[PDB]
Design an enzyme around this catalytic site. Sequence first.
Site, PDB file in Angstrom:
ATOM      1  CG  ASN A 112      -8.027  -3.603   1.918  1.00  0.00           C
ATOM      2  OD1 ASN A 112      -7.264  -2.632   1.940  1.00  0.00           O
ATOM      3  ND2 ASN A 112      -7.598  -4.857   2.029  1.00  0.00           N
ATOM      4  CG  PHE A 166     -14.567  -7.572  -5.118  1.00  0.00           C
ATOM      5  CD1 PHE A 166     -13.615  -6.556  -5.131  1.00  0.00           C
ATOM      6  CD2 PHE A 166     -15.864  -7.266  -4.723  1.00  0.00           C
ATOM      7  CE1 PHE A 166     -13.952  -5.259  -4.757  1.00  0.00           C
ATOM      8  CE2 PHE A 166     -16.210  -5.970  -4.347  1.00  0.00           C
ATOM      9  CZ  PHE A 166     -15.250  -4.967  -4.364  1.00  0.00           C
ATOM     10  CG  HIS A 180      -1.992  -1.024   1.201  1.00  0.00           C
ATOM     11  ND1 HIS A 180      -3.291  -0.734   0.843  1.00  0.00           N
ATOM     12  CD2 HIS A 180      -1.974  -2.341   1.515  1.00  0.00           C
ATOM     13  CE1 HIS A 180      -4.028  -1.827   0.941  1.00  0.00           C
ATOM     14  NE2 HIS A 180      -3.253  -2.817   1.348  1.00  0.00           N
ATOM     15  CB  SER A 219     -15.801  -7.557 -10.620  1.00  0.00           C
ATOM     16  OG  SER A 219     -15.627  -6.621  -9.571  1.00  0.00           O
ATOM     17  CG  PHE A 223     -18.937 -12.289  -6.621  1.00  0.00           C
ATOM     18  CD1 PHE A 223     -19.209 -11.071  -6.011  1.00  0.00           C
ATOM     19  CD2 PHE A 223     -18.096 -12.308  -7.731  1.00  0.00           C
ATOM     20  CE1 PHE A 223     -18.653  -9.884  -6.495  1.00  0.00           C
ATOM     21  CE2 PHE A 223     -17.534 -11.125  -8.226  1.00  0.00           C
ATOM     22  CZ  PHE A 223     -17.815  -9.911  -7.603  1.00  0.00           C
ATOM     23  CE1 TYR A 238      -1.820  -4.840   9.440  1.00  0.00           C
ATOM     24  CE2 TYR A 238      -1.797  -2.620   8.506  1.00  0.00           C
ATOM     25  CZ  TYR A 238      -2.180  -3.953   8.433  1.00  0.00           C
ATOM     26  OH  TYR A 238      -2.936  -4.390   7.367  1.00  0.00           O
ATOM     27  NE  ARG A 262     -18.107  -2.018  -5.892  1.00  0.00           N
ATOM     28  CZ  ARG A 262     -19.340  -2.497  -5.760  1.00  0.00           C
ATOM     29  NH1 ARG A 262     -19.988  -2.967  -6.818  1.00  0.00           N
ATOM     30  NH2 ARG A 262     -19.929  -2.506  -4.570  1.00  0.00           N
ATOM     31  CD  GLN A 293     -19.791 -16.457   1.608  1.00  0.00           C
ATOM     32  OE1 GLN A 293     -18.847 -15.669   1.573  1.00  0.00           O
ATOM     33  NE2 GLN A 293     -20.733 -16.409   2.546  1.00  0.00           N
ATOM     34  CD1 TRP A 316     -20.291 -13.006   8.393  1.00  0.00           C
ATOM     35  CD2 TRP A 316     -21.054 -11.416   9.770  1.00  0.00           C
ATOM     36  NE1 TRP A 316     -19.577 -13.089   9.565  1.00  0.00           N
ATOM     37  CE2 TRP A 316     -20.026 -12.123  10.428  1.00  0.00           C
ATOM     38  CE3 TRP A 316     -21.691 -10.361  10.442  1.00  0.00           C
ATOM     39  CZ2 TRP A 316     -19.617 -11.810  11.726  1.00  0.00           C
ATOM     40  CZ3 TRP A 316     -21.284 -10.050  11.733  1.00  0.00           C
ATOM     41  CH2 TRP A 316     -20.255 -10.775  12.362  1.00  0.00           C
TER      42      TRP A 316
HETATM   43  C1  HEM Z   1      -2.498 -11.212   7.830  1.00  0.00           C
HETATM   44  C2  HEM Z   1      -2.730 -10.201   6.829  1.00  0.00           C
HETATM   45  C3  HEM Z   1      -2.142  -8.935   6.715  1.00  0.00           C
HETATM   46  C4  HEM Z   1      -0.922  -8.485   7.144  1.00  0.00           C
HETATM   47  C5  HEM Z   1       0.152  -9.306   7.857  1.00  0.00           C
HETATM   48  C6  HEM Z   1      -0.798  -7.081   6.720  1.00  0.00           C
HETATM   49  C7  HEM Z   1       0.382  -6.311   6.803  1.00  0.00           C
HETATM   50  C8  HEM Z   1       0.507  -4.990   6.329  1.00  0.00           C
HETATM   51  C9  HEM Z   1       1.718  -4.172   6.433  1.00  0.00           C
HETATM   52  C10 HEM Z   1       3.040  -4.612   7.060  1.00  0.00           C
HETATM   53  C11 HEM Z   1       1.413  -2.930   5.945  1.00  0.00           C
HETATM   54  C12 HEM Z   1       2.298  -1.683   5.888  1.00  0.00           C
HETATM   55  C13 HEM Z   1       1.962  -0.786   7.064  1.00  0.00           C
HETATM   56  C14 HEM Z   1       2.749   0.507   7.069  1.00  0.00           C
HETATM   57  O1  HEM Z   1       3.947   0.477   6.717  1.00  0.00           O
HETATM   58  O2  HEM Z   1       2.176   1.552   7.445  1.00  0.00           O
HETATM   59  C15 HEM Z   1       0.018  -2.986   5.534  1.00  0.00           C
HETATM   60  C16 HEM Z   1      -0.703  -1.880   5.058  1.00  0.00           C
HETATM   61  C17 HEM Z   1      -2.077  -1.864   4.851  1.00  0.00           C
HETATM   62  N1  HEM Z   1      -2.903  -2.976   4.957  1.00  0.00           N
HETATM   63 FE1  HEM Z   1      -2.402  -4.826   5.450  1.00  0.00          FE
HETATM   64  N2  HEM Z   1      -1.960  -6.656   6.083  1.00  0.00           N
HETATM   65  C18 HEM Z   1      -2.778  -7.791   6.055  1.00  0.00           C
HETATM   66  C19 HEM Z   1      -4.091  -7.815   5.586  1.00  0.00           C
HETATM   67  C20 HEM Z   1      -4.814  -6.687   5.207  1.00  0.00           C
HETATM   68  C21 HEM Z   1      -6.286  -6.668   5.120  1.00  0.00           C
HETATM   69  C22 HEM Z   1      -7.194  -7.894   5.137  1.00  0.00           C
HETATM   70  C23 HEM Z   1      -6.665  -5.349   5.027  1.00  0.00           C
HETATM   71  C24 HEM Z   1      -7.952  -4.789   5.017  1.00  0.00           C
HETATM   72  C25 HEM Z   1      -9.101  -5.209   5.797  1.00  0.00           C
HETATM   73  C26 HEM Z   1      -5.414  -4.577   4.994  1.00  0.00           C
HETATM   74  C27 HEM Z   1      -5.360  -3.213   4.790  1.00  0.00           C
HETATM   75  C28 HEM Z   1      -4.181  -2.471   4.746  1.00  0.00           C
HETATM   76  C29 HEM Z   1      -4.150  -1.043   4.508  1.00  0.00           C
HETATM   77  C30 HEM Z   1      -5.328  -0.129   4.199  1.00  0.00           C
HETATM   78  C31 HEM Z   1      -2.856  -0.672   4.592  1.00  0.00           C
HETATM   79  C32 HEM Z   1      -2.350   0.734   4.374  1.00  0.00           C
HETATM   80  C33 HEM Z   1      -2.510   1.639   5.576  1.00  0.00           C
HETATM   81  C34 HEM Z   1      -2.062   3.048   5.283  1.00  0.00           C
HETATM   82  O3  HEM Z   1      -2.699   3.701   4.432  1.00  0.00           O
HETATM   83  O4  HEM Z   1      -1.071   3.501   5.893  1.00  0.00           O
HETATM   84  N3  HEM Z   1      -4.295  -5.397   5.165  1.00  0.00           N
HETATM   85  N4  HEM Z   1      -0.530  -4.245   5.778  1.00  0.00           N
HETATM   86  N   LIG Z   2      -2.129  -5.331   3.428  1.00  0.00           N
END
Ligand code: HEM
Ligand SMILES: [N]
Lengths: 499, 499, 499, 499
Positions: free
Chosen positions: C145, C195, C72, C198, C443, C355, C200, C439, C300
């Site tokens: 997300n 998804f 991201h 698609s 979809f 995080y 989106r 599911q 759900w």
């Molecule tokens: C076990 C699964 C996951 C792990 C280990 C993980 C790990 C990470 C890591 C290490 C970052 C970088 C954070 C940073 O440097 O600020 C990140 C960013 C992000 N992740 Fe995940 N993530 C996972 C699943 C997901 C899921 C399922 C979502 C959403 C429900 C998600 C949404 C995000 C978002 C939005 C960011 C960016 C946050 C920002 O804008 O600073 N992640 N993730």
């Molecule tokens: N993520």
Amino acid sequence: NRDPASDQMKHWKEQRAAQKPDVLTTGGGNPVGDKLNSLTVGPRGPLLVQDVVFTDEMAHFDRERIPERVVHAKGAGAFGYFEVTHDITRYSKAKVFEHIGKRTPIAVRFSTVAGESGSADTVRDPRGFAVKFYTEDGNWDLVGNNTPIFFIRDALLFPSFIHSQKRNPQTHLKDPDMVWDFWSLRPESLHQVSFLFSDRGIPDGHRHMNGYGSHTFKLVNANGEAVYCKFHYKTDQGIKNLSVEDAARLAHEDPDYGLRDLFNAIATGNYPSWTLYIQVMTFSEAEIFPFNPFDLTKVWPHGDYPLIPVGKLVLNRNPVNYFAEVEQLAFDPSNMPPGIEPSPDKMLQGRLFAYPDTHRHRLGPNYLQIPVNCPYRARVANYQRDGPMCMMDNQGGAPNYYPNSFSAPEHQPSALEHRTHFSGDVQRFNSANDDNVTQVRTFYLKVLNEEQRKRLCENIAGHLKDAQLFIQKKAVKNFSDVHPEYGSRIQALLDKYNE
Amino acid sequence: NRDPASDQMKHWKEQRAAQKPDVLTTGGGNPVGDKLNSLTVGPRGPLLVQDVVFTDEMAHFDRERIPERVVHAKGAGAFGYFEVTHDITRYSKAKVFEHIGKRTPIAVRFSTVAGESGSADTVRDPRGFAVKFYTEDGNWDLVGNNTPIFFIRDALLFPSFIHSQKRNPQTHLKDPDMVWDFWSLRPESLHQVSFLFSDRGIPDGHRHMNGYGSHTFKLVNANGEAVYCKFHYKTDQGIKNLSVEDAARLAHEDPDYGLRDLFNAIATGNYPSWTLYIQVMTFSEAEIFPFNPFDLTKVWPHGDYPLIPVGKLVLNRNPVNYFAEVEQLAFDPSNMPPGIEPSPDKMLQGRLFAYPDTHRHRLGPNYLQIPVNCPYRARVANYQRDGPMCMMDNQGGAPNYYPNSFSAPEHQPSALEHRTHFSGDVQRFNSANDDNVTQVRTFYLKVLNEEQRKRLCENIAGHLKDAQLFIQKKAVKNFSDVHPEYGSRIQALLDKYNE
Amino acid sequence: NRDPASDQMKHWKEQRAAQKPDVLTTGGGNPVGDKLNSLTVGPRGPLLVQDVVFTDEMAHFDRERIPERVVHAKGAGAFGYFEVTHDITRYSKAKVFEHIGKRTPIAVRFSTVAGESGSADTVRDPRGFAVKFYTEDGNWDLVGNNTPIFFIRDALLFPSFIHSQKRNPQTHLKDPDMVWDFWSLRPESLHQVSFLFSDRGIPDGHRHMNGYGSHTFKLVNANGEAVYCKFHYKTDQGIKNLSVEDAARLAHEDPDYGLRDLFNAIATGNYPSWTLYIQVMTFSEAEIFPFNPFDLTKVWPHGDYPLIPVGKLVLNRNPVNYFAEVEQLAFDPSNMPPGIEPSPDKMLQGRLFAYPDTHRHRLGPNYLQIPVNCPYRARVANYQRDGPMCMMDNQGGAPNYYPNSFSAPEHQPSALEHRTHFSGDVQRFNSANDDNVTQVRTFYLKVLNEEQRKRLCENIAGHLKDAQLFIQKKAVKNFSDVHPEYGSRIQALLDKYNE
Amino acid sequence: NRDPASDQMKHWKEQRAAQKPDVLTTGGGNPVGDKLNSLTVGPRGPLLVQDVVFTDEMAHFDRERIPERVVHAKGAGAFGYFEVTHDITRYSKAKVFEHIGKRTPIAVRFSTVAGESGSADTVRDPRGFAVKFYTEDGNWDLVGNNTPIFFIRDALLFPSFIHSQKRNPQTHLKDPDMVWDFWSLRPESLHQVSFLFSDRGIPDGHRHMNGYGSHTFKLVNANGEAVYCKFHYKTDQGIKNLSVEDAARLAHEDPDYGLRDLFNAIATGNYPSWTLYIQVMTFSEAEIFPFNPFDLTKVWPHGDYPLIPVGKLVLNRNPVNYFAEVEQLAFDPSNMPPGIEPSPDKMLQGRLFAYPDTHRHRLGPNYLQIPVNCPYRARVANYQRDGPMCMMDNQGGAPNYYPNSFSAPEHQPSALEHRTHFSGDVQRFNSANDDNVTQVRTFYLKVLNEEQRKRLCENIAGHLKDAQLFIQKKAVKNFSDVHPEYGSRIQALLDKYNE
Ligand code: HEM
Ligand SMILES: [N]
Ligand SMILES: [N]
Ligand SMILES: [N]
Ligand SMILES: [N]
């Protein structure tokens, strides 16, 4: 001629005799013309940016230091081997115990606890005795101490305990109020406090003390059967402590007493050794053990759980470069090969996280790539990549995702952890009231004799006397709870001190 | 079958043959039982701290990234060799030029300038063309570009220039006002701007462009005589550029066009090569040169200073792991072996400091220990020690102070720098008004033809049109100072754009 | 004029009004005499170390970059508030939901997933939608997300997944073999893959997409009663996507389309908003749910779990400085105030660790002290101290150990977490086969219509076509498992592509 | 009731009246329910990742440490003010000296040199005495010592000297061979060695010693006229030293004697102060001075260059948090406001680079943003941006490139540095033999009396005796060069020691 340590440079020069000295270069390998005079415009002119010899050298000098260990910052290291002398494969399938006579290289670091990098060796404090076994199944780090127990039984109180043992946030001075306020409010510390202020509080160097894993661990054999254990490594050179007055003197005459003593012993061929033992407790026995068998403030009585011989730990090689081989050494309790696992001990559980975590900070994300920390007897292959200061080939062009259809590393089911069943509510269970005196009473009355009981109280009183009265009262109250005579002796000494 | 790059994993696997896959381990070398399922209490229960397989892998994942280069962040790399074809020992005593036929290993990194690591390759921008020569006298880094000149002539304006070429501090968007306000205020940029907006502004990959040291450097022979020089390495593949249309298309169809092109060229045996030349100017000529010979915005006319052949640069090896061999690659202009020295060029002088400085930040204090940056053809020996992530043996137990009576490394007089004399006041001499148009006029009227000038002006106007009118006016004024038509042709295009 | 974003400087300048420019200083506050010309001996002389104006500025320029987010990395941010519109106190006691009309400041960051900092906004990829609520009980980070589900259901597969979505370790190129080998081997990804490919898959900017917490969370009321929930924040601007053709064009025409769109919307007063809803599932229903309710690859059904309104999210303030307010923004899912807790979701469990861990590396140990990350609506008081770049007063001289008899901070029993019961063996339960198609079929058949299914398969085949045939085969098989028509339509397109 | 330092917590406690203690929170401001018991499954079950209270606290504890200063690691700090008492505006236009009665806040740090953070205060070693003046023209750091001279006169020997004074790279022990081999090989050290081993080598705390800028600096007045100068700040408490015996006792009795002494003095209102003087030498006199006026091993005779009163330095405020206000304190000799400039002193020139450099490493790129280091009496405005741990607003949306047409900060020509003329070759001029004995002889025979000369030799011999005989020989020859009796007395002592 003097001791080996003193003749370090003299010996370096000799073992190089005849050889012409190497050409002095910059970090980039460019030969230096004159590294004793800066590049200026005229004899009394300004320094030039063009002097890249100066900047290259000065910039590195400016970056020599790395954070010291948050705890156990002052230490000494050595290397040698572990040799299996007895068969315990009925308890553990770990390759390191495979066959009698089998040798595994080891790295060891000894240390005090509270003092910083420039503190003295001969001071009252527990002693770190960490052992790294470079096994074929990866590294096994047995991060023990010179005591079978510890001050607390829950990791959440560890940062606080360490803080209380170090410097006041404002004055940067040792603070007896902090030390005893914490201990008096947390009587579970009574057991280790009693050990700490006994003669064993100041070992005569690192060679004259025992090592212990302290925590209860779990061993698993080839049949998938598991038992709980305790690791003990007793000194072959005998227990020997320094008197309070001798320690104080050495504190200023040779703040590096432990470092020097170890180096000279090894240099003269007087290799120190320890006999490794384990205590074994079946799961059934753990369910009926008089106390929480996973409580770090408790020992397993030798009478009920006899020490079982395993092997020998021998240190026969000194570090060549201290910073590279000792300062950078990193031991992770979580480093356990198949056949060795953790127990539910709340403290050990916390340590599984803490060490790799602090290492990624102190050394760097790729600290396991630093030579002394690399599991060089194993084959590191996985799906981890990059990170700052990435050494070697970073596993080349191998597929970096798992699973994959391109023949990259595969997991091995035989390495699966032993399955234990657990049932209960997820909550923060209070362990503050888990019998804080029973074993302490036994230590005071049965383990120690009259002369050491006397010194123990004098040692405690001499330090506790500087805490406020209300703190002395609470502390004494706790000691009285262990045994009225215990608290009474301390109080008498305290009354005298309070003049 | 597809291109070699696309079949990277396919080939890795075939390479493995029938060899059994390695055992998947933790960073500590412990074999992993199941790296696809986390350790929990029950199939729908909480995650355990005890899962050190998860933490070990995730912690490393969490630390994969390092800062990208502050400039030239998007690039490609390759390795090969440099071969001497002619004898220029009368000018330089550098061992890399020692004798005809002499081969020296090299590392090269190509790149754009302003874009971040995820930007596109085929965009208008200068191109970095850094060459690392691993010589016996240490590493020689010729950190060049695909242009013989640059936008400015004093390092104090570099951070500002780069800032103006990047994102607006508030919106994080490219900002035409920033780009052109800076350029219109600093007319010295006219020469390189003219080059940048010409066809050369977007080369077809990295194999169809020339390389230049840009700066005037100094060569010193065995007799201690010195001459000033310019380094030029012309593509043996021929100059080839991408039209604005094709470049824009490739920008989204293949943001990594340059990366792919280079890897495939080498993978298929079509090794790209460059012919290295030098221009030589004596100190006498430098005194009478019509411009400041150390002014980075000026070239040395070939008619007056002919190109002298020296050797060939050949890239015949792709990196195996990009991050390790390319992203961590560090070039320091200050890395110069005896026989090669910097000139008084204010820009070069500043770079002598900037690169090692940013490398200590981006990579780490000990970045010269990273394999690809190590001067492995030389013997690094000095009085530098420690620092984070210290590899190898940190020079063991060798005496760490100089001078010493213990046979440690010694400086070498023959490596002393050439002596140049300077006289003057210590002050900030203004170079802003050092003829900003003469050579630009020659470029516009002589080097370019009619159709090329047309495209030049169209390219400028297409970008300048988005800047405010007052900026456009000042910008056009500068172009008019070069040549009335240069400015008028752009103004006409601008009027059209502004409706 | 032009868009507000383009006029950023113009406005800043106008904001300045008649005020005169401030004095330019070094980082140490020393006024600078001439920051455009370096200090040398003579106009054509060497650069001096004495030029500390140069070093001070250049050294900082050299350290401008920090590692980009491991995932991201490409994003945009904005600020605003959250306003409660409905009473849901029956489910959660969190202060942020305390009463209707209650406002809480928020910070939001939108982003893509795989691309680096210089990549384009309008590309197929999930979209990050992180929301930080600065509540009185500390910060609550809902890191969502633009999709309610994800590709995998166990955190151990996350690093691998991300690796497969990024660059080949040797060529540094996007690799379709990596992408599809992983997805074909891990069928649980079918739901999110459908998804993603698609319509989106490419939202029209950040204002026209929904946000979701994705994970099942737990809410606890004042009575200590708990229920499980899902967070949904639908766009009040309405769902709008970009065609594959338009997205490709914007990819090179304006790679920062999303950044610009959001900045301008807010700058012109067209504040984007979202309506926050939650789905509630009792613990009883959780035990009956046809699927694992904590399975991130499952939604759900709305029919059985109606969306309940809670409040509104409004973004009405752009960042002033992007690096400081957006690039440094850190969201930790573990940041949950009393009333909100995690569920056993294996993926969420892993995020609780990842995080804060990556943040300590990317930003620094004290990253929570960076203004935009500080919980400024709460009073941070604890026993944590020091660490690099320690700001404020580091809690002054307050006692740094707990417990203590000196009135330092005390824990509040009311903030205790909800107690749940768990039972079972401690092992790695395989969840790879937890219904990967049910599911996905709904979809494909209900959520999408005929024309959408048409595009879905075209987008999939358009990318999958570049993978090896054996990979195409496995992938199609998985699609066929969802629905024979799903797989056959893709195969028909693949056969054409493999022309 | 004890000394104020000891009652630090008692006082913190009582200054909070009956105020309810603050709510204990996580770093994210989330209230903690029980920070004394970890979250587990059952009373004797495994620790959960879900316990983010534990991880948040433990992860910060794991990162509390930062690298200690490469030199002068052990110290104490205090704050106060500088007040002008005399008018020296005819010499310098620096705002800090503007008018009689003008007060400028100051920060001060005292320290030893070789010992690490845990070392003892009362040991033989120079004493650091750094003073930070927060002026309106930015910070002015006068990084002085308790001696007017130093051991060497070229910065290229500094890293080596420091290495020789610290630990052996292999044994990690203090090494007399290293110490004396360096000093004996570099006799320029004779002057400072004589001072170091005199009674002044171990001052009684920090309040009883003088401070010196040591280096020759340059002062510039409003008319642009310049003179060279030396800064002297004599203790108003009077010179007082500790005998070798007392210092040794205190070394173990109270390793933090200096810290405690200073803290208690200030806590009790016994504010220590120093009188600041300057010596002035015109440029004409510098041309005729019998020694190099910029030679750090030389003093300016008071008889020819009398001390001129300037103002008073008063310390009346103790640190509230040591780590934040003292450990993080950063003094940069290059921090000089208009009116104060460096001289050609090769050592000073080198320090202009080293301090900011090591600070970027030890503290971080934005270390000048740490409160205690911020020039809060000035208005920092420049074109510097970003970098890790960026605080405040990073100068918001202000134009980030210079020059610009948008009214951002502008340099101020009145701050231009004074212009000095230089003529010479760019070379490494030797300074190793710039009269190493003359002033040393006057010190020995004239400055010291018989009693202190006796002590001087005993102190030297007491340390020299542990070095190898050949080293003792060389060292003695140097002392004899100063004066036959100097070496003779030492030799007699050595003979007694070597039996
Ligand atoms: C076990 C699964 C996951 C792990 C280990 C993980 C790990 C990470 C890591 C290490 C970052 C970088 C954070 C940073 O440097 O600020 C990140 C960013 C992000 N992740 Fe995940 N993530 C996972 C699943 C997901 C899921 C399922 C979502 C959403 C429900 C998600 C949404 C995000 C978002 C939005 C960011 C960016 C946050 C920002 O804008 O600073 N992640 N993730
Ligand atoms: N993520
Ligand atoms: N520890
Ligand atoms: N650059
Ligand atoms: N120093």
